[PDB]
Amino acid sequence: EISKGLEDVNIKWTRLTTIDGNKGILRYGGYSVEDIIASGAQDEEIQYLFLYGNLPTEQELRKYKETVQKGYKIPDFVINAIRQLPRESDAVAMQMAAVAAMAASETKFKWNKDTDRDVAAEMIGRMSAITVNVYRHIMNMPAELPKPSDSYAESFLNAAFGRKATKEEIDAMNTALILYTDHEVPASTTAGLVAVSTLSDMYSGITAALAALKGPLHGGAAEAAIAQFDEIKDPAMVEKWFNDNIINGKKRLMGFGHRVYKTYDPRAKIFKGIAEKLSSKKPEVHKVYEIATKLEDFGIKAFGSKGIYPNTDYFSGIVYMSIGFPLRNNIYTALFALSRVTGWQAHFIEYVEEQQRLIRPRAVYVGPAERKYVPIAER
Amino acid sequence: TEEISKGLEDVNIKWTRLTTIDGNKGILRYGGYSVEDIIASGAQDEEIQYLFLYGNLPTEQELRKYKETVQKGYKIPDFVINAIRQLPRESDAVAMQMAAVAAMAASETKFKWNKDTDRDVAAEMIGRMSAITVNVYRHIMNMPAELPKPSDSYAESFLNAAFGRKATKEEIDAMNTALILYTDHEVPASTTAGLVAVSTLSDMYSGITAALAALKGPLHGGAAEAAIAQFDEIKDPAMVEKWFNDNIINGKKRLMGFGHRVYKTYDPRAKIFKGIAEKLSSKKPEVHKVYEIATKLEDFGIKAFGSKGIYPNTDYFSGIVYMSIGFPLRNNIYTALFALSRVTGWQAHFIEYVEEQQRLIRPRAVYVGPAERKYVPIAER
Ligand SMILES: CC(C)(COP(=O)(O)OP(=O)(O)OC[C@H]1O[C@@H](n2cnc3c(N)ncnc32)[C@H](O)[C@@H]1OP(=O)(O)O)[C@@H](O)[C@H](O)NCCC(=O)NCCCC(=O)C[C@@](O)(CC(=O)O)C(=O)O
Ligand SMILES: CC(C)(COP(=O)(O)OP(=O)(O)OC[C@H]1O[C@@H](n2cnc3c(N)ncnc32)[C@H](O)[C@@H]1OP(=O)(O)O)[C@@H](O)[C@H](O)NCCC(=O)NCCCC(=O)C[C@@](O)(CC(=O)O)C(=O)O
């Protein structure tokens, strides 16, 4: 019978990403994400790694960035797929609308060894363009496109905010990009894999992945976690809130728990370090951080023994808030998606190119036995 | 944790009360009712929608009310219509539906999973799917926007609005049957993608968007166009065996509209579609020609592939029925008409999963990539 939540079912092999959930170890193509972050690698180097299977030389990187910046120009109708929507709309749903627009108009897309990586590189560029325009629309600003610059992170932040981002902001965004690049087969990547396993196009695969990312149990926690801290308002109030909501109210502690990690999420640890550093400079944000660390202590004491620990989404919102993004319209989840689009595409290409099979499971029937079609009077 | 469940074959992802399939004997029941018995009995598509949302056939009272809720979906906001019409006219019809539903996912800020309201939301969305699909068809054909209106039937409301003229009783009855036949099929790739999305507690409209994403592909709902496109390519019945040997038997391509993950015999829906395709196409000689190519190719296919349990599926004949009704072969329109029907099953499954057996869907992969290695700075590579 039933493989609930597909727990421990292997749906593919991958060369892209390994996770040890018991030791809390995450590697991208053999490199620890700690090593990548310490090194100061640019996010484009890690995008290249995902698409090509190795780190690029300076020459390969120059070539790659040129392909990504092709995506910074997007059709007027893709922008308009966003802006023609109401402003109170969820930021991720807005990204879905825009990607659905390309799914629709890219009539020539074909799965092909020779073109897949270039389509994917250009799409990483368009995700930046779409995410800029999602943020501008929500904030009721003019439409704008990212421009080529020293970095993908800088290009994104400069177009989103319409000012020059500082070095510290750019470096934090660059790390955010790397930390959310991929995580093997979470619900979002799985939904996308199901879509591309019918040989539906890359963009539809992204659209499905976004539909799943949106939910509070997955990437939607990037907004729901920080919303808990915002409710608490005052650190003195933490214990009471925690007993009221979590111990006595049976609600889940958002930003804790993971299907795979039964220990502290190694990405959460890095995000926590950045949150502490970036927030301390901003009094309103610093106090959100303080609430979060007090709450975390209670959570770990209550849940640690069940293998339920902070995940990435517990701290990533504070990182985004400190960079300058507001807590509204699930913006934080849209920022997760911007990063994750690289891992989604790399997985879909690996799946379709090398181990293609329709994904089509079964259900256990527990409904009514065969019965004769009843006429209306006798019902 | 070393073996790979390839395509999740025979993995059970949920329990269901809704639909049962016997793959070896070729039996499909909805809520205990055989699809053959449903069609023979003259069920209205609205009765089967109700069946899916509520678990039994409706009394005359329940049905009148249900139909009113559905018709509320016929009024859709102008930005949902515009999500379709601002796209290039050359776009895939299913991807236009996806654009329109994503627009709803964006704007339905108040949606919440709730046993009290799920079924009314789902009923209204079935009306909205009719309005969306009308407008996709209209945009493709460069016609003005239009909304369906209440009539004696959901199928009639749809056809009248799509074509801008009164549908005949024959057309209506064919569409009504196509709506029932495509309602649900347990957990195909589309339903599965949607279930994954809703397992995160994402909203119903996002679940439908993910399902549309998957249905579009040619190994799934895209076959409804790809199979009939084979018949269109062959063009001359004398040429069928030649085509089949050049394209299929040499291993160049799969025979579209044959084969199934579950059925290892003739699809019971395909038997029904075949009977209708024959009756309706015989009234239009240019379409009858298509049907005659199809049945000639079908005979070669079953002789070649029958022993492997590869038989006609639903998509082999469905394009012919839609063509006979008046829908052209272009822009994946036949797949959009599949989606029109299947939205009922999708929602009914999502509701059953979230309400009664909710759990995040989150599998694993087997790692076969590079062993642990030290990061090398870019200057030294
Ligand atoms: C859904 C899940 C993430 C994982 O849970 P599972 O589906 O593996 O386990 P489950 O739902 O069956 O729960 C098992 C038990 O553990 C409890 N539980 C699990 N998480 C809890 C929590 N956070 N608080 C309280 N109880 C929690 C749960 O109630 C239940 O208790 P009982 O029914 O046995 O009483 C939960 O921890 C939980 O809902 N977390 C809160 C929401 C949240 O923070 N989500 C963010 C997760 C991180 C992300 O989405 C990003 C991600 O890492 C995801 C990925 O890789 O999968 C990525 O990079 O793509
Ligand atoms: C994908 C599948 C539907 C099912 O195949 P599986 O994924 O179960 O198996 P597979 O791809 O692993 O194939 C098994 C073998 O059978 C061969 N094969 C299978 N179908 C074939 C075909 N149609 N033509 C030629 N060869 C075919 C295949 O090459 C392979 O050969 P070997 O490598 O063993 O030598 C295939 O039959 C095939 O692609 N069909 C053609 C496209 C097509 O008509 N698809 C429409 C299916 C109908 C629908 O999508 C609607 C659906 O019923 C779907 C549902 O319920 O699942 C619904 O209601 O939602």
JSON list of N, CA and C and ligand atoms in Angstrom, two decimals, chain A residues 356-358 360, chain B residues 9 21 182 184-191 215 218-221 223-224 227 248 253-264 267 269 305 308 310 313-315 338 342, ligand 2:
[
{"chain": "A", "resi": 356, "resn": "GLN", "atom": "N", "xyz": [14.65, 9.63, -18.71]},
{"chain": "A", "resi": 356, "resn": "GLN", "atom": "CA", "xyz": [13.28, 10.03, -19.00]},
{"chain": "A", "resi": 356, "resn": "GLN", "atom": "C", "xyz": [12.32, 8.85, -18.82]},
{"chain": "A", "resi": 357, "resn": "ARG", "atom": "N", "xyz": [11.28, 9.07, -18.04]},
{"chain": "A", "resi": 357, "resn": "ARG", "atom": "CA", "xyz": [10.16, 8.17, -17.98]},
{"chain": "A", "resi": 357, "resn": "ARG", "atom": "C", "xyz": [8.98, 8.97, -17.41]},
{"chain": "A", "resi": 358, "resn": "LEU", "atom": "N", "xyz": [7.81, 8.74, -17.98]},
{"chain": "A", "resi": 358, "resn": "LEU", "atom": "CA", "xyz": [6.58, 9.35, -17.47]},
{"chain": "A", "resi": 358, "resn": "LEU", "atom": "C", "xyz": [6.41, 9.08, -15.97]},
{"chain": "A", "resi": 360, "resn": "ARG", "atom": "N", "xyz": [3.95, 8.47, -13.09]},
{"chain": "A", "resi": 360, "resn": "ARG", "atom": "CA", "xyz": [2.53, 8.11, -13.11]},
{"chain": "A", "resi": 360, "resn": "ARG", "atom": "C", "xyz": [2.36, 7.00, -12.10]},
{"chain": "B", "resi": 9, "resn": "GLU", "atom": "N", "xyz": [6.36, 3.94, -11.02]},
{"chain": "B", "resi": 9, "resn": "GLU", "atom": "CA", "xyz": [5.48, 2.86, -11.41]},
{"chain": "B", "resi": 9, "resn": "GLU", "atom": "C", "xyz": [5.07, 1.99, -10.19]},
{"chain": "B", "resi": 21, "resn": "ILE", "atom": "N", "xyz": [-9.56, 1.77, -11.49]},
{"chain": "B", "resi": 21, "resn": "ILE", "atom": "CA", "xyz": [-9.14, 1.28, -12.78]},
{"chain": "B", "resi": 21, "resn": "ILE", "atom": "C", "xyz": [-8.66, -0.17, -12.65]},
{"chain": "B", "resi": 182, "resn": "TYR", "atom": "N", "xyz": [-13.52, 12.18, -19.85]},
{"chain": "B", "resi": 182, "resn": "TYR", "atom": "CA", "xyz": [-12.25, 12.75, -19.41]},
{"chain": "B", "resi": 182, "resn": "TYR", "atom": "C", "xyz": [-12.27, 13.27, -17.97]},
{"chain": "B", "resi": 184, "resn": "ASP", "atom": "N", "xyz": [-11.94, 12.13, -14.89]},
{"chain": "B", "resi": 184, "resn": "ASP", "atom": "CA", "xyz": [-10.93, 11.68, -13.96]},
{"chain": "B", "resi": 184, "resn": "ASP", "atom": "C", "xyz": [-10.31, 10.34, -14.36]},
{"chain": "B", "resi": 185, "resn": "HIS", "atom": "N", "xyz": [-9.10, 10.10, -13.90]},
{"chain": "B", "resi": 185, "resn": "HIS", "atom": "CA", "xyz": [-8.47, 8.84, -14.16]},
{"chain": "B", "resi": 185, "resn": "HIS", "atom": "C", "xyz": [-7.50, 8.50, -13.08]},
{"chain": "B", "resi": 186, "resn": "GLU", "atom": "N", "xyz": [-7.94, 8.70, -11.84]},
{"chain": "B", "resi": 186, "resn": "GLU", "atom": "CA", "xyz": [-7.18, 8.33, -10.67]},
{"chain": "B", "resi": 186, "resn": "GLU", "atom": "C", "xyz": [-5.97, 9.29, -10.53]},
{"chain": "B", "resi": 187, "resn": "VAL", "atom": "N", "xyz": [-4.72, 8.80, -10.61]},
{"chain": "B", "resi": 187, "resn": "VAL", "atom": "CA", "xyz": [-3.55, 9.72, -10.45]},
{"chain": "B", "resi": 187, "resn": "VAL", "atom": "C", "xyz": [-2.57, 9.70, -11.65]},
{"chain": "B", "resi": 188, "resn": "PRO", "atom": "N", "xyz": [-3.04, 10.16, -12.81]},
{"chain": "B", "resi": 188, "resn": "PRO", "atom": "CA", "xyz": [-2.16, 10.39, -13.96]},
{"chain": "B", "resi": 188, "resn": "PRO", "atom": "C", "xyz": [-1.12, 11.51, -13.67]},
{"chain": "B", "resi": 189, "resn": "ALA", "atom": "N", "xyz": [-0.22, 11.83, -14.62]},
{"chain": "B", "resi": 189, "resn": "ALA", "atom": "CA", "xyz": [0.85, 12.83, -14.35]},
{"chain": "B", "resi": 189, "resn": "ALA", "atom": "C", "xyz": [0.27, 14.21, -13.98]},
{"chain": "B", "resi": 190, "resn": "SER", "atom": "N", "xyz": [-0.79, 14.65, -14.66]},
{"chain": "B", "resi": 190, "resn": "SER", "atom": "CA", "xyz": [-1.37, 15.97, -14.37]},
{"chain": "B", "resi": 190, "resn": "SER", "atom": "C", "xyz": [-1.89, 16.00, -12.93]},
{"chain": "B", "resi": 191, "resn": "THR", "atom": "N", "xyz": [-2.69, 14.99, -12.57]},
{"chain": "B", "resi": 191, "resn": "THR", "atom": "CA", "xyz": [-3.29, 14.96, -11.22]},
{"chain": "B", "resi": 191, "resn": "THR", "atom": "C", "xyz": [-2.19, 14.90, -10.16]},
{"chain": "B", "resi": 215, "resn": "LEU", "atom": "N", "xyz": [-0.29, 18.26, -18.08]},
{"chain": "B", "resi": 215, "resn": "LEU", "atom": "CA", "xyz": [-1.22, 17.73, -19.10]},
{"chain": "B", "resi": 215, "resn": "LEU", "atom": "C", "xyz": [-0.78, 18.07, -20.54]},
{"chain": "B", "resi": 218, "resn": "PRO", "atom": "N", "xyz": [3.23, 15.84, -24.60]},
{"chain": "B", "resi": 218, "resn": "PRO", "atom": "CA", "xyz": [2.72, 14.85, -25.57]},
{"chain": "B", "resi": 218, "resn": "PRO", "atom": "C", "xyz": [2.65, 13.42, -25.08]},
{"chain": "B", "resi": 219, "resn": "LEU", "atom": "N", "xyz": [3.34, 13.06, -23.99]},
{"chain": "B", "resi": 219, "resn": "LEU", "atom": "CA", "xyz": [3.17, 11.70, -23.44]},
{"chain": "B", "resi": 219, "resn": "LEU", "atom": "C", "xyz": [1.89, 11.58, -22.60]},
{"chain": "B", "resi": 220, "resn": "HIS", "atom": "N", "xyz": [1.32, 12.74, -22.24]},
{"chain": "B", "resi": 220, "resn": "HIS", "atom": "CA", "xyz": [0.07, 12.82, -21.48]},
{"chain": "B", "resi": 220, "resn": "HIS", "atom": "C", "xyz": [-1.02, 13.46, -22.37]},
{"chain": "B", "resi": 221, "resn": "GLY", "atom": "N", "xyz": [-1.65, 14.53, -21.90]},
{"chain": "B", "resi": 221, "resn": "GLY", "atom": "CA", "xyz": [-2.78, 15.12, -22.61]},
{"chain": "B", "resi": 221, "resn": "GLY", "atom": "C", "xyz": [-2.44, 15.67, -24.00]},
{"chain": "B", "resi": 223, "resn": "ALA", "atom": "N", "xyz": [-1.18, 14.20, -26.26]},
{"chain": "B", "resi": 223, "resn": "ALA", "atom": "CA", "xyz": [-1.44, 13.18, -27.28]},
{"chain": "B", "resi": 223, "resn": "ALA", "atom": "C", "xyz": [-2.76, 13.42, -28.03]},
{"chain": "B", "resi": 224, "resn": "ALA", "atom": "N", "xyz": [-3.70, 14.12, -27.38]},
{"chain": "B", "resi": 224, "resn": "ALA", "atom": "CA", "xyz": [-5.02, 14.36, -27.95]},
{"chain": "B", "resi": 224, "resn": "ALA", "atom": "C", "xyz": [-4.87, 15.14, -29.26]},
{"chain": "B", "resi": 227, "resn": "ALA", "atom": "N", "xyz": [-1.82, 12.54, -31.69]},
{"chain": "B", "resi": 227, "resn": "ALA", "atom": "CA", "xyz": [-2.34, 11.34, -32.38]},
{"chain": "B", "resi": 227, "resn": "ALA", "atom": "C", "xyz": [-3.06, 11.74, -33.70]},
{"chain": "B", "resi": 248, "resn": "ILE", "atom": "N", "xyz": [7.33, 4.36, -37.12]},
{"chain": "B", "resi": 248, "resn": "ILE", "atom": "CA", "xyz": [7.11, 3.67, -35.90]},
{"chain": "B", "resi": 248, "resn": "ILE", "atom": "C", "xyz": [7.97, 2.40, -35.85]},
{"chain": "B", "resi": 253, "resn": "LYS", "atom": "N", "xyz": [9.83, 6.92, -33.84]},
{"chain": "B", "resi": 253, "resn": "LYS", "atom": "CA", "xyz": [8.81, 7.58, -32.99]},
{"chain": "B", "resi": 253, "resn": "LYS", "atom": "C", "xyz": [7.83, 6.60, -32.31]},
{"chain": "B", "resi": 254, "resn": "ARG", "atom": "N", "xyz": [7.20, 7.03, -31.21]},
{"chain": "B", "resi": 254, "resn": "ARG", "atom": "CA", "xyz": [6.13, 6.23, -30.58]},
{"chain": "B", "resi": 254, "resn": "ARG", "atom": "C", "xyz": [4.82, 6.45, -31.32]},
{"chain": "B", "resi": 255, "resn": "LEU", "atom": "N", "xyz": [3.98, 5.43, -31.34]},
{"chain": "B", "resi": 255, "resn": "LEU", "atom": "CA", "xyz": [2.67, 5.55, -31.92]},
{"chain": "B", "resi": 255, "resn": "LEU", "atom": "C", "xyz": [1.75, 6.34, -30.92]},
{"chain": "B", "resi": 256, "resn": "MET", "atom": "N", "xyz": [1.44, 7.58, -31.26]},
{"chain": "B", "resi": 256, "resn": "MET", "atom": "CA", "xyz": [0.70, 8.49, -30.35]},
{"chain": "B", "resi": 256, "resn": "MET", "atom": "C", "xyz": [-0.77, 8.04, -30.26]},
{"chain": "B", "resi": 257, "resn": "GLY", "atom": "N", "xyz": [-1.33, 8.01, -29.04]},
{"chain": "B", "resi": 257, "resn": "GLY", "atom": "CA", "xyz": [-2.71, 7.51, -28.84]},
{"chain": "B", "resi": 257, "resn": "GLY", "atom": "C", "xyz": [-2.70, 6.01, -28.61]},
{"chain": "B", "resi": 258, "resn": "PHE", "atom": "N", "xyz": [-1.52, 5.38, -28.56]},
{"chain": "B", "resi": 258, "resn": "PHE", "atom": "CA", "xyz": [-1.42, 3.97, -28.10]},
{"chain": "B", "resi": 258, "resn": "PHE", "atom": "C", "xyz": [-0.63, 3.92, -26.81]},
{"chain": "B", "resi": 259, "resn": "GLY", "atom": "N", "xyz": [-0.95, 2.96, -25.94]},
{"chain": "B", "resi": 259, "resn": "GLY", "atom": "CA", "xyz": [-0.13, 2.69, -24.78]},
{"chain": "B", "resi": 259, "resn": "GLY", "atom": "C", "xyz": [-0.68, 3.42, -23.57]},
{"chain": "B", "resi": 260, "resn": "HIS", "atom": "N", "xyz": [-0.34, 2.90, -22.39]},
{"chain": "B", "resi": 260, "resn": "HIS", "atom": "CA", "xyz": [-0.87, 3.45, -21.14]},
{"chain": "B", "resi": 260, "resn": "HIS", "atom": "C", "xyz": [-0.09, 2.90, -19.96]},
{"chain": "B", "resi": 261, "resn": "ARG", "atom": "N", "xyz": [0.20, 3.72, -18.97]},
{"chain": "B", "resi": 261, "resn": "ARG", "atom": "CA", "xyz": [0.85, 3.22, -17.77]},
{"chain": "B", "resi": 261, "resn": "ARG", "atom": "C", "xyz": [0.04, 2.09, -17.08]},
{"chain": "B", "resi": 262, "resn": "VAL", "atom": "N", "xyz": [-1.28, 2.20, -17.12]},
{"chain": "B", "resi": 262, "resn": "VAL", "atom": "CA", "xyz": [-2.16, 1.31, -16.35]},
{"chain": "B", "resi": 262, "resn": "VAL", "atom": "C", "xyz": [-2.82, 0.24, -17.25]},
{"chain": "B", "resi": 263, "resn": "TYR", "atom": "N", "xyz": [-3.53, 0.66, -18.30]},
{"chain": "B", "resi": 263, "resn": "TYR", "atom": "CA", "xyz": [-4.23, -0.26, -19.23]},
{"chain": "B", "resi": 263, "resn": "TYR", "atom": "C", "xyz": [-3.27, -1.07, -20.07]},
{"chain": "B", "resi": 264, "resn": "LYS", "atom": "N", "xyz": [-3.42, -2.39, -20.01]},
{"chain": "B", "resi": 264, "resn": "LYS", "atom": "CA", "xyz": [-2.63, -3.31, -20.82]},
{"chain": "B", "resi": 264, "resn": "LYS", "atom": "C", "xyz": [-3.60, -4.03, -21.74]},
{"chain": "B", "resi": 267, "resn": "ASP", "atom": "N", "xyz": [-8.39, 0.74, -24.02]},
{"chain": "B", "resi": 267, "resn": "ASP", "atom": "CA", "xyz": [-8.88, 1.69, -23.02]},
{"chain": "B", "resi": 267, "resn": "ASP", "atom": "C", "xyz": [-10.44, 1.70, -23.15]},
{"chain": "B", "resi": 269, "resn": "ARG", "atom": "N", "xyz": [-12.55, 3.95, -22.27]},
{"chain": "B", "resi": 269, "resn": "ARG", "atom": "CA", "xyz": [-12.94, 5.26, -22.81]},
{"chain": "B", "resi": 269, "resn": "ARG", "atom": "C", "xyz": [-12.73, 5.37, -24.33]},
{"chain": "B", "resi": 305, "resn": "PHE", "atom": "N", "xyz": [1.70, -4.18, -31.58]},
{"chain": "B", "resi": 305, "resn": "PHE", "atom": "CA", "xyz": [1.97, -3.81, -30.16]},
{"chain": "B", "resi": 305, "resn": "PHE", "atom": "C", "xyz": [1.08, -4.47, -29.12]},
{"chain": "B", "resi": 308, "resn": "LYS", "atom": "N", "xyz": [2.45, -6.65, -26.44]},
{"chain": "B", "resi": 308, "resn": "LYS", "atom": "CA", "xyz": [3.14, -5.95, -25.36]},
{"chain": "B", "resi": 308, "resn": "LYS", "atom": "C", "xyz": [2.17, -5.20, -24.42]},
{"chain": "B", "resi": 310, "resn": "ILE", "atom": "N", "xyz": [0.14, -2.87, -25.46]},
{"chain": "B", "resi": 310, "resn": "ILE", "atom": "CA", "xyz": [0.06, -1.49, -25.96]},
{"chain": "B", "resi": 310, "resn": "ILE", "atom": "C", "xyz": [-1.11, -1.38, -26.95]},
{"chain": "B", "resi": 313, "resn": "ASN", "atom": "N", "xyz": [-5.48, 4.25, -26.58]},
{"chain": "B", "resi": 313, "resn": "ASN", "atom": "CA", "xyz": [-5.94, 4.92, -25.41]},
{"chain": "B", "resi": 313, "resn": "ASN", "atom": "C", "xyz": [-6.95, 5.99, -25.83]},
{"chain": "B", "resi": 314, "resn": "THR", "atom": "N", "xyz": [-7.50, 6.64, -24.83]},
{"chain": "B", "resi": 314, "resn": "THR", "atom": "CA", "xyz": [-8.45, 7.73, -25.02]},
{"chain": "B", "resi": 314, "resn": "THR", "atom": "C", "xyz": [-8.06, 8.82, -26.07]},
{"chain": "B", "resi": 315, "resn": "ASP", "atom": "N", "xyz": [-6.78, 9.17, -26.16]},
{"chain": "B", "resi": 315, "resn": "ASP", "atom": "CA", "xyz": [-6.37, 10.26, -27.04]},
{"chain": "B", "resi": 315, "resn": "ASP", "atom": "C", "xyz": [-6.31, 9.87, -28.52]},
{"chain": "B", "resi": 338, "resn": "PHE", "atom": "N", "xyz": [-9.62, 18.53, -23.28]},
{"chain": "B", "resi": 338, "resn": "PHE", "atom": "CA", "xyz": [-9.28, 17.53, -22.26]},
{"chain": "B", "resi": 338, "resn": "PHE", "atom": "C", "xyz": [-9.23, 18.21, -20.87]},
{"chain": "B", "resi": 342, "resn": "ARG", "atom": "N", "xyz": [-11.18, 17.57, -17.24]},
{"chain": "B", "resi": 342, "resn": "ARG", "atom": "CA", "xyz": [-10.43, 16.95, -16.19]},
{"chain": "B", "resi": 342, "resn": "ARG", "atom": "C", "xyz": [-10.31, 17.85, -14.94]},
{"chain": "C", "resi": 2, "resn": "LIG", "atom": "C1", "xyz": [3.95, 7.03, -21.75]},
{"chain": "C", "resi": 2, "resn": "LIG", "atom": "C2", "xyz": [2.97, 5.93, -22.12]},
{"chain": "C", "resi": 2, "resn": "LIG", "atom": "C3", "xyz": [1.54, 6.49, -22.04]},
{"chain": "C", "resi": 2, "resn": "LIG", "atom": "C4", "xyz": [3.08, 4.78, -21.12]},
{"chain": "C", "resi": 2, "resn": "LIG", "atom": "O1", "xyz": [4.39, 4.21, -21.17]},
{"chain": "C", "resi": 2, "resn": "LIG", "atom": "P1", "xyz": [5.12, 3.89, -19.76]},
{"chain": "C", "resi": 2, "resn": "LIG", "atom": "O2", "xyz": [5.75, 5.17, -19.20]},
{"chain": "C", "resi": 2, "resn": "LIG", "atom": "O3", "xyz": [4.18, 3.10, -18.87]},
{"chain": "C", "resi": 2, "resn": "LIG", "atom": "O4", "xyz": [6.25, 2.90, -20.30]},
{"chain": "C", "resi": 2, "resn": "LIG", "atom": "P2", "xyz": [7.60, 3.31, -21.05]},
{"chain": "C", "resi": 2, "resn": "LIG", "atom": "O5", "xyz": [7.74, 4.69, -21.66]},
{"chain": "C", "resi": 2, "resn": "LIG", "atom": "O6", "xyz": [8.64, 2.87, -20.03]},
{"chain": "C", "resi": 2, "resn": "LIG", "atom": "O7", "xyz": [7.49, 2.29, -22.28]},
{"chain": "C", "resi": 2, "resn": "LIG", "atom": "C5", "xyz": [7.59, 0.86, -22.11]},
{"chain": "C", "resi": 2, "resn": "LIG", "atom": "C6", "xyz": [8.04, 0.23, -23.43]},
{"chain": "C", "resi": 2, "resn": "LIG", "atom": "O8", "xyz": [6.95, 0.21, -24.39]},
{"chain": "C", "resi": 2, "resn": "LIG", "atom": "C7", "xyz": [7.28, 0.98, -25.54]},
{"chain": "C", "resi": 2, "resn": "LIG", "atom": "N1", "xyz": [6.08, 1.81, -25.86]},
{"chain": "C", "resi": 2, "resn": "LIG", "atom": "C8", "xyz": [5.16, 2.21, -24.95]},
{"chain": "C", "resi": 2, "resn": "LIG", "atom": "N2", "xyz": [4.19, 2.94, -25.59]},
{"chain": "C", "resi": 2, "resn": "LIG", "atom": "C9", "xyz": [4.49, 2.98, -26.90]},
{"chain": "C", "resi": 2, "resn": "LIG", "atom": "C10", "xyz": [3.89, 3.59, -28.11]},
{"chain": "C", "resi": 2, "resn": "LIG", "atom": "N3", "xyz": [2.72, 4.29, -27.99]},
{"chain": "C", "resi": 2, "resn": "LIG", "atom": "N4", "xyz": [4.52, 3.41, -29.30]},
{"chain": "C", "resi": 2, "resn": "LIG", "atom": "C11", "xyz": [5.67, 2.71, -29.42]},
{"chain": "C", "resi": 2, "resn": "LIG", "atom": "N5", "xyz": [6.24, 2.15, -28.33]},
{"chain": "C", "resi": 2, "resn": "LIG", "atom": "C12", "xyz": [5.73, 2.24, -27.09]},
{"chain": "C", "resi": 2, "resn": "LIG", "atom": "C13", "xyz": [8.46, 1.84, -25.11]},
{"chain": "C", "resi": 2, "resn": "LIG", "atom": "O9", "xyz": [9.31, 2.15, -26.23]},
{"chain": "C", "resi": 2, "resn": "LIG", "atom": "C14", "xyz": [9.19, 0.96, -24.12]},
{"chain": "C", "resi": 2, "resn": "LIG", "atom": "O10", "xyz": [9.93, 0.02, -24.91]},
{"chain": "C", "resi": 2, "resn": "LIG", "atom": "P3", "xyz": [11.25, -0.80, -24.40]},
{"chain": "C", "resi": 2, "resn": "LIG", "atom": "O11", "xyz": [12.24, 0.28, -24.02]},
{"chain": "C", "resi": 2, "resn": "LIG", "atom": "O12", "xyz": [10.72, -1.67, -23.25]},
{"chain": "C", "resi": 2, "resn": "LIG", "atom": "O13", "xyz": [11.65, -1.59, -25.63]},
{"chain": "C", "resi": 2, "resn": "LIG", "atom": "C15", "xyz": [3.38, 5.33, -23.48]},
{"chain": "C", "resi": 2, "resn": "LIG", "atom": "O14", "xyz": [2.52, 4.30, -23.91]},
{"chain": "C", "resi": 2, "resn": "LIG", "atom": "C16", "xyz": [3.47, 6.19, -24.75]},
{"chain": "C", "resi": 2, "resn": "LIG", "atom": "O15", "xyz": [4.32, 7.25, -24.64]},
{"chain": "C", "resi": 2, "resn": "LIG", "atom": "N6", "xyz": [2.21, 6.49, -25.36]},
{"chain": "C", "resi": 2, "resn": "LIG", "atom": "C17", "xyz": [2.14, 7.39, -26.51]},
{"chain": "C", "resi": 2, "resn": "LIG", "atom": "C18", "xyz": [1.73, 8.81, -26.07]},
{"chain": "C", "resi": 2, "resn": "LIG", "atom": "C19", "xyz": [0.26, 8.74, -25.63]},
{"chain": "C", "resi": 2, "resn": "LIG", "atom": "O16", "xyz": [-0.59, 8.27, -26.37]},
{"chain": "C", "resi": 2, "resn": "LIG", "atom": "N7", "xyz": [-0.04, 9.21, -24.41]},
{"chain": "C", "resi": 2, "resn": "LIG", "atom": "C20", "xyz": [-1.44, 9.37, -24.00]},
{"chain": "C", "resi": 2, "resn": "LIG", "atom": "C21", "xyz": [-1.79, 8.49, -22.78]},
{"chain": "C", "resi": 2, "resn": "LIG", "atom": "C22", "xyz": [-3.24, 8.81, -22.37]},
{"chain": "C", "resi": 2, "resn": "LIG", "atom": "C23", "xyz": [-3.30, 10.00, -21.41]},
{"chain": "C", "resi": 2, "resn": "LIG", "atom": "O17", "xyz": [-2.33, 10.70, -21.21]},
{"chain": "C", "resi": 2, "resn": "LIG", "atom": "C24", "xyz": [-4.56, 10.30, -20.62]},
{"chain": "C", "resi": 2, "resn": "LIG", "atom": "C25", "xyz": [-4.61, 9.44, -19.31]},
{"chain": "C", "resi": 2, "resn": "LIG", "atom": "O18", "xyz": [-5.24, 8.20, -19.67]},
{"chain": "C", "resi": 2, "resn": "LIG", "atom": "C26", "xyz": [-3.26, 9.19, -18.60]},
{"chain": "C", "resi": 2, "resn": "LIG", "atom": "C27", "xyz": [-3.23, 8.26, -17.37]},
{"chain": "C", "resi": 2, "resn": "LIG", "atom": "O19", "xyz": [-4.24, 7.90, -16.74]},
{"chain": "C", "resi": 2, "resn": "LIG", "atom": "O20", "xyz": [-2.11, 7.86, -16.99]},
{"chain": "C", "resi": 2, "resn": "LIG", "atom": "C28", "xyz": [-5.52, 10.19, -18.38]},
{"chain": "C", "resi": 2, "resn": "LIG", "atom": "O21", "xyz": [-6.73, 9.93, -18.44]},
{"chain": "C", "resi": 2, "resn": "LIG", "atom": "O22", "xyz": [-5.06, 11.07, -17.65]}
]
